[PDB]
Amino acid sequence: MPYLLISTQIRMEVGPTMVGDEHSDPELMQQLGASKRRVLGNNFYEYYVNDPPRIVLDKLECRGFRVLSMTGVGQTLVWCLHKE
């Protein structure tokens, strides 16, 4: 599992920050302190964290991930990270 995707909305200086989907590494999710949920109406679970994306990026580097690309889409800021 080399790739990871995280995102935040409306504003970058505050969370929540989405850190994973249903098939995400349970350990990594736990390391980040990410909660899991399925918003009413959605057909999928998501892992989130209350930290600002910047904080989640630092933690992620410690686990060996690096930011490959960052992009906006709608009102969503997305980071694409790659491990090794």
């Binding site: 918003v39 009413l40 109406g41 959605n42 057909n43 709608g74 009102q75």
Partner: protein, 194 residues
């Protein structure tokens, strides 16, 4: 357990007595030629407004759901709805607007209208009514998304509050693509807009 014709008849008298009580408690003589049958009529009315309790989405469900291989937004707008405010027991009147992105399965008009009646005819709160209709549609169709919007005039601000029949309360529940895709939400609001 869903209320039933029996429950009503066995309770009617209790309601009639309560209203007859209220008549007195206000200053009226429940004996006047025009106030005699009121306790009963009031009671029958108060039951008709809450007849939704004696039903469940199930009674409607499968009876009218057709396959039409359709996967584009469908909208039923300007549906009249009357309900009772669970806070003052005064009714709030308005319109309901429903839209959904089918996943092959479509709902019949009558069935849709039946879902609205079932939850509106009972003590309610606009925010809750909105959400129940949305979920009921979601469960009966497993659609890609669904949206419900209610606009109503609350009589406890028309007569009460001061004199505000002008005021309007707008609530909405957006599930699935209607929640996540700003474009679907915009189109939905545009098509019911006029």
């Amino acid at each position: 357990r869903p209320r039933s014709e029996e429950d009503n008849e066995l309770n009617l008298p209790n309601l009639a007595a309560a209203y007859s009580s209220i008549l007195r408690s206000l200053g009226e003589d429940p004996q006047r030629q025009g106030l005699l049958k009121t306790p009963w009529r009031a009671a029958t009315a108060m039951q008709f407004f809450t007849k939704g309790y004696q039903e469940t989405i199930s009674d409607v469900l499968n009876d009218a759901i057709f396959d039409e291989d359709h996967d584009e937004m469908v909208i039923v707008k300007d549906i009249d709805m009357f309900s009772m405010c669970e806070h003052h027991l005064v009714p709030f009147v308005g319109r309901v607007h429903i839209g959904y992105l089918p996943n092959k399965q479509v709902l019949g008009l009558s069935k849709l209208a039946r879902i609205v009646e079932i939850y509106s005819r009972r003590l309610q709160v606009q925010e809750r009514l909105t959400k129940q209709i949305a979920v009921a549609i979601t469960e009966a169709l497993q659609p890609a998304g669904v949206g419900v919007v209610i606009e109503a005039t609350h009589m406890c601000m028309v007569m009460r509050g001061v004199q505000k029949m002008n005021s309007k309360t707008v609530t909405s529940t957006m599930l699935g693509v209607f929640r996540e895709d700003p474009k679907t939400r915009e189109e939905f609001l545009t098509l019911i807009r006029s």
